[PDB]
Each structure stands twice: as structure tokens, then as C-alpha cells.
Amino acid sequence: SATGLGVSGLVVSSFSAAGKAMSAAQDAISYVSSMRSKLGALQNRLEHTISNLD
Amino acid sequence: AVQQEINQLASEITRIASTTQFNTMNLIDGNFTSKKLQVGSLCGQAITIDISDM
């Protein structure tokens, strides 16, 4: 969610808060990258498990 | 007769100062201080635009 990723209420109305919004949006790209890394490596396990059980 | 033009021209300098704008902000009235450009991908990669009163 926007709360779970820290992008709830990004405020861009000045250089300082707009840089704090850039930091949060890049950290959120890094959080979603690491979550999709877990789901990627996990689907690697299951394509191997299906190749094994079959 | 010189003073007529030396007063009208000095009024024109202050008309340039309060009238010239970018995106509706005054540039050369002296209130364009500490106005950061953001010139890269990360939080706070600034260049500062500063202009004295003209």
C-alpha cells in the first residue's frame, strides 16, 4: 500500500519536501524491487519443484 | 530638461525590476534568493539561483 511503502502523503510544494518525496519514491522503488525479488526467487523454486514432482 | 529624462529613465529601471518575471515570479527585484534548481536524480543535487535587487 502507499502506507506500507512510505509514499502516503508525499508533499512536493518546496525543494526540501520535494526532495523528501524523491527519497521516499526511490526507497519505495527499492522496497518493491526487493519484494519482487522474493516473488522472483520463489517462482524459481516452484518451476524447479514442478520439474521435480512431475 | 535633462532631469525629465533622468527621472523617466530611473522609473524605467524600477519598472524593469518589478515587471520582469518567469512563470509569474519576479526575477530581479531581489526576492529571487536561495531558489534551488534540482539538477540530478537524487534528494538535494542543487544549483542555487541568487539575484540582487536591480
CSV table of C-alpha atoms in Angstrom, one decimal:
chain,number,residue,atom,x,y,z
A,1,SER,CA,0.0,0.0,0.0
A,2,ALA,CA,1.1,3.7,-0.2
A,3,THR,CA,1.3,3.5,3.6
A,4,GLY,CA,3.4,0.2,3.5
A,5,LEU,CA,5.9,1.8,1.1
A,6,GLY,CA,6.0,5.2,2.9
A,7,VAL,CA,4.5,7.1,-0.1
A,8,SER,CA,1.3,8.1,1.8
A,9,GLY,CA,1.3,11.9,1.7
A,10,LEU,CA,4.4,12.8,-0.4
A,11,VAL,CA,4.4,16.6,-0.2
A,12,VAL,CA,6.1,18.4,-3.2
A,13,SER,CA,5.3,22.1,-2.5
A,14,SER,CA,9.0,23.2,-1.9
A,15,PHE,CA,12.6,22.0,-2.9
A,16,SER,CA,13.1,20.4,0.6
A,17,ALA,CA,9.8,18.5,0.8
A,18,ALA,CA,10.0,17.6,-2.9
A,19,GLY,CA,13.5,16.1,-2.3
A,20,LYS,CA,12.0,14.2,0.7
A,21,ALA,CA,9.4,12.9,-1.8
A,22,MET,CA,12.1,11.9,-4.2
A,23,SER,CA,13.9,9.9,-1.4
A,24,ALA,CA,10.6,8.2,-0.4
A,25,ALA,CA,9.7,7.3,-4.1
A,26,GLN,CA,13.2,5.9,-4.7
A,27,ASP,CA,13.1,3.9,-1.4
A,28,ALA,CA,9.7,2.6,-2.5
A,29,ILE,CA,11.2,1.5,-5.8
A,30,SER,CA,13.8,-0.3,-3.7
A,31,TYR,CA,11.1,-1.9,-1.5
A,32,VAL,CA,9.0,-3.1,-4.5
A,33,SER,CA,12.3,-4.3,-6.2
A,34,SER,CA,13.1,-6.4,-3.0
A,35,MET,CA,9.5,-7.7,-2.8
A,36,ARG,CA,9.6,-8.7,-6.5
A,37,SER,CA,13.0,-10.2,-5.8
A,38,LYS,CA,11.4,-12.5,-3.2
A,39,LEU,CA,8.5,-13.4,-5.5
A,40,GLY,CA,11.0,-14.0,-8.4
A,41,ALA,CA,13.3,-16.3,-6.4
A,42,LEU,CA,10.2,-18.1,-5.0
A,43,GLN,CA,8.8,-18.7,-8.6
A,44,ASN,CA,12.3,-20.1,-9.4
A,45,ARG,CA,11.7,-22.6,-6.5
A,46,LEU,CA,8.3,-23.6,-7.9
A,47,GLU,CA,9.4,-24.1,-11.5
A,48,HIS,CA,12.1,-26.4,-10.1
A,49,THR,CA,9.6,-28.1,-7.8
A,50,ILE,CA,7.1,-28.7,-10.7
A,51,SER,CA,10.0,-30.1,-12.9
A,52,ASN,CA,10.9,-32.4,-9.9
A,53,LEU,CA,7.4,-33.6,-8.9
A,54,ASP,CA,6.4,-34.3,-12.5
B,1,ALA,CA,15.1,69.2,-19.3
B,2,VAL,CA,17.8,66.6,-18.6
B,3,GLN,CA,16.2,65.9,-15.2
B,4,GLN,CA,12.9,65.0,-17.0
B,5,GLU,CA,14.7,62.1,-18.8
B,6,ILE,CA,16.9,61.1,-15.8
B,7,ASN,CA,13.6,60.8,-13.7
B,8,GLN,CA,11.7,58.9,-16.5
B,9,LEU,CA,14.6,56.5,-17.1
B,10,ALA,CA,15.1,55.8,-13.4
B,11,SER,CA,11.4,54.9,-13.2
B,12,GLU,CA,12.0,52.6,-16.2
B,13,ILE,CA,14.8,50.7,-14.3
B,14,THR,CA,12.3,50.1,-11.4
B,15,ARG,CA,9.6,49.1,-14.0
B,16,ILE,CA,12.1,46.5,-15.4
B,17,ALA,CA,12.9,45.3,-11.8
B,18,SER,CA,9.3,44.8,-10.6
B,19,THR,CA,7.9,43.7,-14.0
B,20,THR,CA,10.3,41.0,-15.4
B,21,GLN,CA,9.1,37.6,-14.4
B,22,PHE,CA,9.4,33.9,-15.2
B,23,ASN,CA,6.4,31.7,-14.6
B,24,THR,CA,4.9,34.8,-12.7
B,25,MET,CA,7.8,35.0,-10.1
B,26,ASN,CA,9.8,38.3,-10.1
B,27,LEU,CA,13.4,37.7,-11.1
B,28,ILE,CA,15.4,40.9,-10.5
B,29,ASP,CA,13.6,42.7,-7.7
B,30,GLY,CA,15.9,41.0,-5.2
B,31,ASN,CA,13.4,38.4,-3.9
B,32,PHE,CA,14.9,35.7,-6.2
B,33,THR,CA,17.4,34.5,-3.5
B,34,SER,CA,18.2,30.9,-2.5
B,35,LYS,CA,16.0,29.5,-5.3
B,36,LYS,CA,17.4,26.0,-5.9
B,37,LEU,CA,17.4,24.2,-9.3
B,38,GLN,CA,17.3,20.4,-8.9
B,39,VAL,CA,20.0,19.2,-11.5
B,40,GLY,CA,20.2,15.5,-10.9
B,41,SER,CA,18.4,12.3,-9.9
B,42,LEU,CA,18.8,12.3,-6.0
B,43,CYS,CA,17.5,14.3,-3.0
B,44,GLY,CA,19.3,17.7,-3.0
B,45,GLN,CA,21.5,17.9,-6.1
B,46,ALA,CA,21.0,21.6,-6.3
B,47,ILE,CA,22.3,24.7,-8.0
B,48,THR,CA,21.3,28.0,-6.3
B,49,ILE,CA,20.0,30.9,-8.3
B,50,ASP,CA,20.5,34.2,-6.5
B,51,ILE,CA,19.9,37.7,-7.9
B,52,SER,CA,20.5,41.1,-6.0
B,53,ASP,CA,17.9,43.9,-6.2
B,54,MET,CA,18.1,45.6,-9.7
